Each structure stands twice: as C-alpha cells, then as structure tokens.
Amino acid sequence: IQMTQSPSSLSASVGDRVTITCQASQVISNYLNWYQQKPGKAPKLLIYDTSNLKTGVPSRFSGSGSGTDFTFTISSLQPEDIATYYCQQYENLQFTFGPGTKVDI
Amino acid sequence: VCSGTLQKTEDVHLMGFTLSGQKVADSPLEASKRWAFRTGVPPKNVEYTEGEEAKTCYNISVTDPSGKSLLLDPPSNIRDYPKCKTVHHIQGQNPHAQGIALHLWGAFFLYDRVASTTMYRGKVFTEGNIAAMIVNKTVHRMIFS
Amino acid sequence: VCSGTLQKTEDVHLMGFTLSGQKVADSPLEASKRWAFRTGVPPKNVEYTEGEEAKTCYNISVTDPSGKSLLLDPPSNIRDYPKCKTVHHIQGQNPHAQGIALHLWGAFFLYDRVASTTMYRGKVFTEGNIAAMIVNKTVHRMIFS
Amino acid sequence: VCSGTLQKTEDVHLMGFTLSGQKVADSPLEASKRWAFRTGVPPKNVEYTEGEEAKTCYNISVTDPSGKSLLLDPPSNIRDYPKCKTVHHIQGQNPHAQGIALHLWGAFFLYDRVASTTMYRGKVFTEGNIAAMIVNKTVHRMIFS
Amino acid sequence: SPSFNTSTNISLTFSYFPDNDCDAELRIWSVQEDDGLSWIPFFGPGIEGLYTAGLIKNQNNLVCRLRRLANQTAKSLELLLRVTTEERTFSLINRHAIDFLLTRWGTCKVLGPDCCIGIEDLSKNIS
Amino acid sequence: SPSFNTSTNISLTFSYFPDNDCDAELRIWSVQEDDGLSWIPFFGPGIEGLYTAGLIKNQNNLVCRLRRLANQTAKSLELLLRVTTEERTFSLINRHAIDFLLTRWGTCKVLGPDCCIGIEDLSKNIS
Amino acid sequence: SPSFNTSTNISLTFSYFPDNDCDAELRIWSVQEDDGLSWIPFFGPGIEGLYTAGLIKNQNNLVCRLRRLANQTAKSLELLLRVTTEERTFSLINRHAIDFLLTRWGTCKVLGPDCCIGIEDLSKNIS
Numbered sequence: 001i002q003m004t005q006s007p008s009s010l011s012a013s014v015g016d017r018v019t020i021t022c023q024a025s026q027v028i029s030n031y032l033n034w035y036q037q038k039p040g041k042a043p044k045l046l047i048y049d050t051s052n053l054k055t056g057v058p059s060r061f062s063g064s065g066s067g068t069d070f071t072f073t074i075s076s077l078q079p080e081d082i083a084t085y086y087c088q089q090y091e092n093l094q095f096t097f098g099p100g101t102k103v104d105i
Numbered sequence: 106v107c108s109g110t111l112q113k114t115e116d117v118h119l120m121g122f123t124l125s126g127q128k129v130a131d132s133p134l135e136a137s138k139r140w141a142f143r144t145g146v147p148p149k150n151v152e153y154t155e156g157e158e159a160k161t162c163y164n165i166s167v168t169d170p171s172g173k174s175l176l177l178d179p180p181s182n183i184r185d186y187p188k189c190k191t192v193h194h195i196q197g198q199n200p201h202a203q204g205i206a207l208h209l210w211g212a213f214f215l216y217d218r219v220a221s222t223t224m225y226r227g228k229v230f231t232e233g234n235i236a237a238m239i240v241n242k243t244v245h246r247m248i249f250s
Numbered sequence: 251v252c253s254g255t256l257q258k259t260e261d262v263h264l265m266g267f268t269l270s271g272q273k274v275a276d277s278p279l280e281a282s283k284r285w286a287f288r289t290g291v292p293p294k295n296v297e298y299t300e301g302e303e304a305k306t307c308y309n310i311s312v313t314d315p316s317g318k319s320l321l322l323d324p325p326s327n328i329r330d331y332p333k334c335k336t337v338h339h340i341q342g343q344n345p346h347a348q349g350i351a352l353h354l355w356g357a358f359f360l361y362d363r364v365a366s367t368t369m370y371r372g373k374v375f376t377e378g379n380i381a382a383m384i385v386n387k388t389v390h391r392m393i394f395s
Numbered sequence: 396v397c398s399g400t401l402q403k404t405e406d407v408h409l410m411g412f413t414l415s416g417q418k419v420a421d422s423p424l425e426a427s428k429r430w431a432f433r434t435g436v437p438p439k440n441v442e443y444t445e446g447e448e449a450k451t452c453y454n455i456s457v458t459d460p461s462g463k464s465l466l467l468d469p470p471s472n473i474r475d476y477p478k479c480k481t482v483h484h485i486q487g488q489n490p491h492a493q494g495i496a497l498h499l500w501g502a503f504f505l506y507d508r509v510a511s512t513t514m515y516r517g518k519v520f521t522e523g524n525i526a527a528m529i530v531n532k533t534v535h536r537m538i539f540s
Numbered sequence: 541s542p543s544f545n546t547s548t549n550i551s552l553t554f555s556y557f558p559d560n561d562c563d564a565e566l567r568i569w570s571v572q573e574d575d576g577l578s579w580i581p582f583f584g585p586g587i588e589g590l591y592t593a594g595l596i597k598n599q600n601n602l603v604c605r606l607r608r609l610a611n612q613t614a615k616s617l618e619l620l621l622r623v624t625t626e627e628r629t630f631s632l633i634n635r636h637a638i639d640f641l642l643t644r645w646g647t648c649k650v651l652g653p654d655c656c657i658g659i660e661d662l663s664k665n666i667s
Numbered sequence: 668s669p670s671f672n673t674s675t676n677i678s679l680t681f682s683y684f685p686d687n688d689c690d691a692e693l694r695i696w697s698v699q700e701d702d703g704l705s706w707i708p709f710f711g712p713g714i715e716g717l718y719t720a721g722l723i724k725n726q727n728n729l730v731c732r733l734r735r736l737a738n739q740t741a742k743s744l745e746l747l748l749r750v751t752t753e754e755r756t757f758s759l760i761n762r763h764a765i766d767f768l769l770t771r772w773g774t775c776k777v778l779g780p781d782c783c784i785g786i787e788d789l790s791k792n793i794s
Numbered sequence: 795s796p797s798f799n800t801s802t803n804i805s806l807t808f809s810y811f812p813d814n815d816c817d818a819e820l821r822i823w824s825v826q827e828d829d830g831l832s833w834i835p836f837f838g839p840g841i842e843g844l845y846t847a848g849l850i851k852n853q854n855n856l857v858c859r860l861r862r863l864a865n866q867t868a869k870s871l872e873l874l875l876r877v878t879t880e881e882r883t884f885s886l887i888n889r890h891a892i893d894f895l896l897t898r899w900g901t902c903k904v905l906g907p908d909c910c911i912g913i914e915d916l917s918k919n920i921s
C-alpha cells in the first residue's frame with residue numbers, strides 16, 4: 001500500500017542522538033530489519049527483529065517499535081556512521097525496502 | 106455436591122474464551138511464535154456452543170517454496186470465526202515444515218462453534234480455550250435478550 | 251410425569267411418517283413446488299429407526315444447462331428409501347440455481363434410516379417427518395411379528 | 396443387580412482380545428480362510444479403549460489381475476495395530492472378487508483403538524473381539540503402572 | 541416422551557394426546573432381528589431382505605396422533621439441528637435417553653411430584 | 668460442573684471458585700433462537716445474521732473466574748481428546764450430561780452426602 | 795456390565811461368571827496418561843511412545859472369563875451395528891454408560907430389588 005521512512009535527509013553533529021522512523025505497509029507479520037549502506041558499498045544489517053542486533057554491531061545502535069510504527073536510534077553518533085539507512089519488511093511474499101534515511105554530520 | 110441442578114441437556118453450554126481476553130499479545134508476529142508444525146499427531150476437534158468476540162483474527166496461508174500449502178484441508182464443518190474486530194491476512198513460507206500445525210501453549214484454534222488442535226487452510230480463527238458451564242433457558246435468554 | 255418407563259436405550263425409536271399419509275399432493279409437479287435452492291445454509295442429517303411405506307418416491311436429477319448437477323453429493327451413509335409404491339424418475343434444469351435444495355415446509359427428505367435437510371444427487375427419497383416414541387422389546391416384536 | 400458402581404464415564408473400558416489368545420491358527424494360510432468378499436453390506440466401525448498384544452499381524456494387499464486393489468480405502472481414523480510380534484506381508488489376487496472383505500466368524504479386524512467389519516487397504520490388523528468392562532481410576536493405574 | 545404399548549384396558553395404546561386429514565392404514569418397516577448364523581455380517585440379510593414389515597391399526601385415532609406428532613416434533617428438531625455444526629449424521633436416540641433420565645432425576649422430594657420413588661411398600665413395612 | 672444463574676442475594680452468579688490479568692468486558696455470541704417462519708431452514712437466518720450478541724458484566728471477578736476456568740479445563744480436555752480416534756467433531760455436551768447423572772446417582776444412603784434426595788417434607792408427613 | 799477390581803478377599807477380581815482353550819498370559823496396551831508438559835499435543839508422546847504396557851494374571855480363570863466374554867459380546871455387538879447407518883466410528887462407551895443409568899433408575903420401590911437406595915443408616919436414625 002505505502003511504506004514510508006522519515007526523515008528523507010538528516011544532518012547532525014558528531015555525538016548527537018538521532019532517531020529515525022519507519023512505517024510498514026501492513027501490521028508486522030515477519031522480522032523487521034534495519035540496514036546500513038555506506039556510499040559505494042553494499043548494505044549491512046545492524047538490527048533484526050525490530051530490537052535484536054547482529055553480533056559485532058556496536059552497542060550505540062538500538063531499535064524498538066510495534067505494530068505499524070517503528071524507530072531506529074543511535075545513542076552517540078560517530079564519523080563512520082554516515083550512511084543511508086533502510087528498513088526491511090517481508091509481507092505477502094515480498095521483501096520491500098523503505099525509502100531510506102540519509103544522515104550527514 | 107448437590108448444589109446446582111441440570112434440567113435439559115441443552116442447558117449445558119461450552120463457552121470459548123479468546124486469549125485476547127487473557128491480555129496476551131495480539132500481534133501476528135508474536136502470535137506466530139505460539140504455533141509450530143509437528144508430524145505424528147492426529148488432529149482432534151471439539152464443538153462448543155458459545156464464544157467470545159475476538160479482538161484479532163488470522164487468515165494464514167503457509168506454503169512450500171514450491172507453492173504447496175502446508176496447512177490441513179478444512180473439513181466441511183469448519184467455518185470462519187463469527188465475530189472479529191480485525192482480521193490479519195498473512196502469507197508465510199516454511200521449507201523444512203513437516204506434519205501439521207499445532208499450538209505450543211495447548212490452546213485451541215477456535216473456529217465457528219468448533220475448537221481444533223490444528224490450524225486449517227484458508228479459515229479464519231482465534232486462539233482460545235473453552236469452558237463447561239450450565240445456564241438454564243431463562244438465564245440464557247436474559248444475557249442475549 | 252412419572253407415567254411410562256424406559257428400560258434400555260434401544261427401546262426409544264424414531265418413526266418417520268411420510269407426507270403421503272398426511273394426504274398431501276403426491277404428484278411430482280406439485281411436489282416439486284415444495285422445494286427450493288438456497289445458498290448459505292449447512293446441510294444437517296438425523297438418523298431414525300423406523301419409517302412408513304411410501305406411496306410415491308422421487309429420483310430427481312436437476313442439472314445446469316451445461317450439464318452440471320446442482321444436487322449435493324450424497325455421503326456414504328445415505329441410501330435409497332427402502333419401500334416405495336411408485337418411483338418418479340425426473341430430470342430437471344435450473345440455470346439460476348444457487349446453493350443447495352431445501353424443503354419449504356420444513357419437512358425432511360427421508361432416506362433409508364436418515365432424515366436430511368437437503369436432497370442428495372441420485373438417491374430416492376420421500377417427503378416426511380420423524381417422531382420420537384418408546385416401545386419396549388415385547389411390544390415392538392408384536393407389531394412386526 | 397446393585398453389585399458394582401460406575402463413577403465416571405471414563406472408567407468404562409472396551410478391551411479387544413485377539414483370536415491368537417483363543418488358540419486359533421495364526422498362520423496366514425489358515426487365517427486367509429476366515430475372510431471372504433461380499434457385496435451389499437455396509438462397513439461399520441466401533442472404537443475401543445484397550446487391546447491385547449497380538450501374536451501375528453497381517454498387512455494384506457489383494458488386487459485385481461489388472462492391478463486394482465479390492466480392499467476398501469481406510470478412513471483417517473484407521474491406523475495400524477499398535478503391538479505385533481510378527482507382521483505377515485501378503486500380496487494376493489482375486490479376479491472374481493466383489494464387494495468388500497468381511498469376517499466369516501463374525502469377529503472384527505482390530506485396528507488401533509478401532510474394531511472394523513471390513514479389512515482396509517494397506518493397514519495392519521489382527522483378528523479379535525472386544526468386551527465391555529468397568530475399571531475405576533485406581534484399578535486401571537495398578538495394572539499398567 | 542410418549543410411549544406405545546399393548547392395551548391394558550392386538551390393540552395398542554399411545555400415551556400422547558394433543559390438547560380425516562390423516563391416513564388410516566400405517567404400514568412400517570424395521571431392521572430389528574429376532575433373537576443362529578444370521579447375525580454374522582457375511583451371512584444373513586444384505587440390503588434387500590433387511591427390512592421387516594409391520595402394521596399399526598388406528599384405534600381411537602392412534603395413527604393420527606402419531607402422524608400429528610411427527611408433524612409437530614419436526615419444528616423443534618429443525619431448531620435443534622441449527623446449533624450442531626456436524627454435517628454428518630447425529631444420533632438423536634442417545635439425546636432423548638439422557639433427557640429422559642435428567643427429567644426424572646437431574647434433588648427431589650420423596651413426597652409429591654417430580655420424584656418417581658415408590659414408597660407404597662415402604663409405608664407398610666414401617667408399621 | 669459449575670453453573671451461572673441470576674443473583675438470589677441483571678446481576679448473575681457463578682458457583683465456581685478457584686481455591687488484573689483478565690479482561691473486564693465480555694462480549695459473546697450464540698445461535699439460540701427465541702421461541703413463526705424462522706425455524707424453517709430455507710427461511711430465517713443464513714450464515715450472516717445467525718449469531719445473537721450478549722454481554723456479561725464482571726461482578727466479583729465473575730468474568731475472570733470464567734476466563735480462568737477455560738484456561739484450566741483445556742488441560743484436561745486435551746488429554747480427553749488423545750484417547751478418541753475420530754478426527755471429526757466429538758460432542759462434549761452429551762458427555763458432561765451423563766457425567767452429571769453418574770456423579771449424582773451412578774447406590775446411595777438417604778442420609779448424609781453423596782445422595783441428593785429430599786426428605787425434609789417426608790420427615791413432617793411421618794409425624 | 796461386569797467390573798474388574800482389586801481383590802477384597804496385585805490380585806484382581808471380575809464380577810462376571812458364565813453359567814485350557816484360553817491363553818494364560820494377557821499383555822495389554824493403553825493410552826491413559828499419569829496425572830507437566832506431556833498433555834500438550836505438540837509435546838509428550840506421538841504415535842510411537844503413546845501406548846503403556848500392562849499385564850493381567852489369570853486368577854481363578856480370570857483371563858479366560860475375559861476372553862470368553864469378548865467371544866460372546868461380539869454376537870450382540872454385530873447386531874447393534876446393523877441398525878446404525880453411519881460408516882464412521884460409533885462411540886460405545888457412551889451407550890454402555892446410559893444403559894447403566896437406565897437399568898438402575900430408568901420409578902422403583904425403596905424396598906426390595908430393582909432400586910439401589912441405601913436405607914440401612916435411615917432405619918437407625920428414625921429409632
């Protein structure tokens with residue numbers, strides 16, 4: 001129906017806590033994941049199942065949400081966290097990615 | 106022991122109470138964690154008389170990667186649950202799946218006047234349990250008017 | 251209230267009486283006016299023990315203009331009515347027909363030891379109703395010798 | 396008459412005793428002489444609670460010379476007999492065969508918690524009969540420990 | 541639940557009463573077998589010679605009270621079938637039997653109605 | 668087996684007792700029809716307008732004792748289903764009814780418990 | 795209907811009596827479960843480890859009276875199956891239960907047979 005991700009762009013100094021939102025097309029029925037894609041490279045998931053984080057991902061990354069509204073939060077921003085962040089949704093046998101959130105320092 | 110009297114066999118009723126009233130997670134993601142597929146267990150059914158209005162209902166279709174639906178074929182007596190506030194339409198996949206879908210808590214997949222051990226294909230249900238109680242003709246008429 | 255006693259559960263019998271004994275029209279034209287097709291109603295069955303010898307029986311086959319028979323598939327337990335004086339063999343057509351055939355009077359399509367809400371395909375029946383009564387082993391033996 | 400008391404409906408049990416305990420011929424050749432095929436008889440089933448450990452069991456497949464198996468299709472509730480000392484795997488042929496296989500002695504083809512009038516296709520069975528008896532919760536617990 | 545019995549004054553009686561439309565003759569059929577080899581399913585009857593003929597004479601509109609009973613009991617039977625979801629057959633004789641036991645026993649005072657206990661031989665043994 | 672009834676002191680009562688997790692409101696649905704043409708299967712309701720709405724108020728955790736009863740009775744119901752081999756539906760109301768008759772009548776001494784016979788009017792008639 | 799019980803003088807007793815062909819040993823199997831997680835259908839047994847073993851010793855031709863009972867009861871059971879038209883399974887335990895209630899209660903005089911009412915404690919309370 002409609003999958004949105006806000007904000008579209010972002011600019012925050014180093015050390016700031018920034019949160020991003022993701023709205024799924026339907027009520028969540030499978031794992032919701034979050035990916036970090038630095039310019040040029042391939043995406044890399046940091047958070048899976050809305051809350052859990054992959055082994056090796058820094059502790060500053062966190063996530064929460066329920067239903068159709070979800071959030072992605074980083075506690076203390078660092079210079080190598082600049083990337084376009086996407087949220088993944090698997091509904092109706094379709095993997096759909098969010099518009100993405102470009103964060104700048 | 107002698108407390109209470111039963112007049113006719115129609116007065117004994119089986120009421121199905123949804124797990125939604127037990128304040129458990131209604132979300133389909135957490136609800137899908139309560140079911141699992143297992144081989145070697147026969148499916149059993151029990152008919153009941155009354156049931157609760159469900160807060161969330163589910164119409165799931167778990168399929169093989171080839172397309173084969175792993176849920177059982179619903180017998181004729183199985184029909185959609187009567188009253189649902191919201192019906193989640195879910196389409197899943199499970200390649201390793203074997204056997205038939207059962208409830209991990211021991212609850213029943215409530216269908217219209219039927220409680221089932223297995224989730225049937227293409228039929229709306231709700232998680233719940235049933236309870237045996239006696240209400241005579243006059244008392245039953247008062248509650249439903 | 252205390253009048254009458256029931257010894258064994260075999261002694262309670264359900265006797266099906268044909269509408270022919272009620273002096274209603276036995277002709278298949280007037281009898282076809284007593285049935286109609288309706289969707290959204292489940293078919294129900296009740297088994298009985300004894301029945302009356304029917305004056306007129308019907309073996310009907312109502313089909314789509316394409317050829318599709320609109321009558322339900324008879325389950326295994328359904329069999330032709332035992333005793334019929336005359337069996338009308340009828341082949342009908344109904345393009346608008348939906349659902350399943352029911353009785354407009356509320357009577358039952360009597361089959362062998364079975365009363366049905368629906369008329370089944372390719373099975374002889376008679377219109378009638380059933381009645382609950384008690385006859386002990388000695389009395390039942392006297393009537394049938 | 397007043398001797399004995401029944402507390403709950405779960406305490407009445409139906410025990411199936413094999414014909415092997417009656418010291419009849421267990422050999423499949425002599426056992427095949429106890430069955431025959433007949434048309435015009437409906438198959439009936441009765442569920443029981445307990446059964447004996449069988450000395451010899453049979454998995455027979457009687458087929459037409461064309462290849463058509465003459466044994467009935469087993470319903471879902473029919474399953475192999477639980478405990479068998481030896482299971483004879485037999486493949487037979489009968490061109491003249493009509494109807495369905497019945498027992499000439501009047502015994503039952505014992506399946507898991509089911510006694511049948513007919514031998515079903517591809518399902519292990521044993522010849523036996525069932526008996527109605529009452530054992531209360533405490534007595535039943537003692538025998539099976 | 542009514543009951544039919546030999547007349548106590550082959551005449552029969554029916555306990556039920558309702559407070560030219562009926563047919564006088566009443567031919568019936570039943571499957572009950574008289575109590576060597578007929579009980580075995582392979583032997584005995586098949587589907588043809590399975591039914592036994594019977595005849596009930598109309599004595600004080602006996603058949604008409606039977607026929608008017610089925611015309612009336614079907615109106616409740618249809619409602620009793622709406623609740624059960626099973627499309628297959630549904631045993632009614634077991635339900636009438638337990639309804640008979642519950643209407644007679646399902647706490648009752650030894651004296652007065654609603655409690656069928658025989659004390660006529662108890663009142664003489666006490667004296 | 669418990670029973671729900673109008674309060675004897677529209678308030679209702681439940682005989683069962685167990686010795687914020689529950690939901691207060693309890694909307695229910697039933698198929699029972701009030702006692703002209705509605706009983707005929709062709710007429711009356713279909714599958715849409717077949718269920719009647721009801722509501723039970725929580726009076727002294729009434730709904731919570733009902734909800735905690737179904738949470739507990741299912742543990743025995745699952746074991747009662749393991750023995751029966753029929754995959755189709757299985758009537759439980761008939762079994763509870765005969766269990767009710769057997770627990771009340773299924774030899775009992777007129778005096779004391781385990782025998783619900785009313786002699787309070789018999790003790791006055793003897794004097 | 796007979797009943798098997800612990801001996802009142804692990805020896806058992808059977809109430810039935812009929813007035814070297816039998817097998818002495820009698821191994822049996824049952825599905826009854828002893829009364830945490832086993833009752834849930836997903837957990838506990840499947841179709842393999844579902845049956846529990848048992849053994850009944852022949853004490854005063856105990857097993858032989860059991861075996862000769864099934865040899866005889868089948869002759870009536872076959873006739874009881876001819877009337878019911880349902881090809882599927884047919885519950886016999888429910889029918890034996892209601893037959894037990896009807897043979898004990900289904901009008902009876904407090905004195906004499908055919909009425910199992912205990913007055914031995916009533917005769918002492920009146921004096």
Ligand SMILES: *[C@@H]1O[C@H](CO)[C@@H](O[C@@H]2O[C@H](CO)[C@@H](O[C@@H]3O[C@H](CO[C@H]4O[C@H](CO)[C@@H](O)[C@H](O)[C@@H]4O)[C@@H](O)[C@H](O[C@H]4O[C@H](CO)[C@@H](O)[C@H](O)[C@@H]4O[C@H]4O[C@H](CO)[C@@H](O)[C@H](O)[C@@H]4O)[C@@H]3O)[C@H](O)[C@H]2NC(C)=O)[C@H](O)[C@H]1NC(C)=O
Nearest residue numbers: 124127128129209210211212213233234737738739741742
């Ligand atoms: C009547 O109503 C009550 C209450 O509404 C309801 O009770 C519920 O029962 C179910 C079980 O039937 C409970 O589910 C269990 O929950 C516990 C606790 O979960 C908490 O703790 C874990 C770990 O700390 C947290 O991660 C979690 O977020 C919760 O906070 C779990 O421990 C259980 O999981 C184990 O058992 C499962 C059985 O299916 C396994 O599938 C699972 O893998 C777990 O196994 C464990 O052990 C294994 C070997 O030892 C190991 O391999 C595993 O990895 C794991 O360690 C289970 O999920 C539920 O919580 C109860 N609800 C409440 C509110 O208490 C009744 O069920 C209901 N009755 C009916 C008939 O409906």
Ligand SMILES: *[C@@H]1O[C@H](CO)[C@@H](O[C@@H]2O[C@H](CO)[C@@H](O[C@@H]3O[C@H](CO[C@H]4O[C@H](CO)[C@@H](O)[C@H](O)[C@@H]4O)[C@@H](O)[C@H](O[C@H]4O[C@H](CO)[C@@H](O)[C@H](O)[C@@H]4O[C@H]4O[C@H](CO)[C@@H](O)[C@H](O)[C@@H]4O)[C@@H]3O)[C@H](O)[C@H]2NC(C)=O)[C@H](O)[C@H]1NC(C)=O
Nearest residue numbers: 269272273274354355356357358378379610611612614615
């Ligand atoms: C026990 O035994 C009794 C007696 O044997 C039996 O009673 C019978 O009940 C049925 C209904 O269940 C009766 O059938 C009705 O008959 C009346 C009267 O018909 C006469 O009058 C008309 C008009 O004057 C004449 O044309 C006709 O020739 C007759 O002389 C009809 O009025 C009924 O039709 C209406 O209702 C039908 C319901 O199915 C509709 O389908 C039909 O269209 C009619 O509707 C009317 O109203 C509509 C809106 O208002 C309108 O759209 C229509 O056009 C029409 O105006 C119906 O046919 C039957 O007569 C009874 N038999 C006797 C001898 O009285 C019980 O049924 C039986 N019980 C059981 C359980 O079996």
Ligand SMILES: *[C@@H]1O[C@H](CO)[C@@H](O[C@@H]2O[C@H](CO)[C@@H](O[C@@H]3O[C@H](CO[C@H]4O[C@H](CO)[C@@H](O)[C@H](O)[C@@H]4O)[C@@H](O)[C@H](O[C@H]4O[C@H](CO)[C@@H](O)[C@H](O)[C@@H]4O[C@H]4O[C@H](CO)[C@@H](O)[C@H](O)[C@@H]4O)[C@@H]3O)[C@H](O)[C@H]2NC(C)=O)[C@H](O)[C@H]1NC(C)=O
Nearest residue numbers: 414417418419499500501502503523524864865866868869
């Ligand atoms: C409870 O337990 C008991 C005992 O365990 C068990 O009894 C058994 O009953 C069956 C019948 O149901 C008996 O089977 C019959 O056996 C007799 C005797 O056979 C001996 O004699 C013959 C001839 O002398 C010898 O050849 C043979 O080797 C034996 O020594 C047979 O006569 C019977 O056959 C006739 O009847 C059959 C019925 O199915 C026919 O199929 C068969 O063709 C035979 O018919 C005769 O007459 C016809 C016309 O008159 C003619 O056309 C035929 O050619 C033939 O002459 C039958 O096989 C068995 O022996 C009993 N067992 C014992 C130990 O006595 C109960 O059945 C059991 N109850 C339940 C419910 O399980």
Ligand SMILES: *[C@@H]1O[C@H](CO)[C@@H](O[C@@H]2O[C@H](CO)[C@@H](O)[C@H](O)[C@H]2NC(C)=O)[C@H](O)[C@H]1NC(C)=O
Nearest residue numbers: 163164165166185192193194195226227228229
């Ligand atoms: C639940 O899902 C099933 C299947 O996904 C739906 O059944 C379909 O219903 C439509 C409309 O009646 C038919 O055209 C399809 O052929 C059906 N498919 C199957 C597989 O049965 C069902 O309608 C859904 N229920 C709800 C309430 O949405």
Ligand SMILES: *[C@@H]1O[C@H](CO)[C@@H](O[C@@H]2O[C@H](CO)[C@@H](O)[C@H](O)[C@H]2NC(C)=O)[C@H](O)[C@H]1NC(C)=O
Nearest residue numbers: 308309310311330337338339340371372373374
């Ligand atoms: C009633 O009609 C049905 C079908 O019109 C008859 O069933 C046929 O019976 C013949 C002979 O047994 C078979 O060869 C056909 O294949 C059957 N057709 C179907 C569709 O089942 C039935 O015999 C008729 N009954 C009577 C008493 O005439």
Ligand SMILES: *[C@@H]1O[C@H](CO)[C@@H](O[C@@H]2O[C@H](CO)[C@@H](O)[C@H](O)[C@H]2NC(C)=O)[C@H](O)[C@H]1NC(C)=O
Nearest residue numbers: 453454455456475482483484485516517518519
């Ligand atoms: C009894 O025989 C039947 C058929 O001869 C066996 O059923 C077969 O089982 C295998 C393995 O599960 C399947 O691959 C076949 O498709 C089955 N065939 C049929 C016709 O069902 C059954 O396993 C045998 N039982 C025993 C205990 O040996």
Ligand SMILES: *[C@@H]1O[C@H](CO)[C@@H](O[C@@H]2O[C@H](CO)[C@@H](O)[C@H](O)[C@H]2NC(C)=O)[C@H](O)[C@H]1NC(C)=O
Nearest residue numbers: 257385386387388389390544545546547548549
């Ligand atoms: C079947 O019913 C008849 C009649 O109700 C029973 O015969 C009665 O038996 C009682 C007790 O022996 C006598 O007091 C009556 O006088 C008899 N009445 C008649 C008309 O003969 C008969 O016993 C019943 N049979 C069974 C097996 O219960």
Ligand SMILES: *[C@@H]1O[C@H](CO)[C@@H](O[C@@H]2O[C@H](CO)[C@@H](O)[C@H](O)[C@H]2NC(C)=O)[C@H](O)[C@H]1NC(C)=O
Nearest residue numbers: 112240241242243244245671672673674675676
């Ligand atoms: C349904 O239950 C109510 C309440 O238990 C019954 O009303 C009682 O009737 C008895 C006998 O007439 C009185 O002694 C009580 O005082 C009544 N109680 C109340 C609260 O009114 C009612 O009779 C029952 N209805 C049926 C059809 O059995």
Ligand SMILES: *[C@@H]1O[C@H](CO)[C@@H](O[C@@H]2O[C@H](CO)[C@@H](O)[C@H](O)[C@H]2NC(C)=O)[C@H](O)[C@H]1NC(C)=O
Nearest residue numbers: 402530531532533534535798799800801802803
């Ligand atoms: C199962 O049966 C046994 C034996 O019949 C019951 O034990 C008897 O209990 C009564 C009443 O407490 C005593 O008077 C007897 O002396 C006991 N007999 C024996 C042999 O111990 C036992 O109570 C029954 N269990 C259940 C649950 O009903």
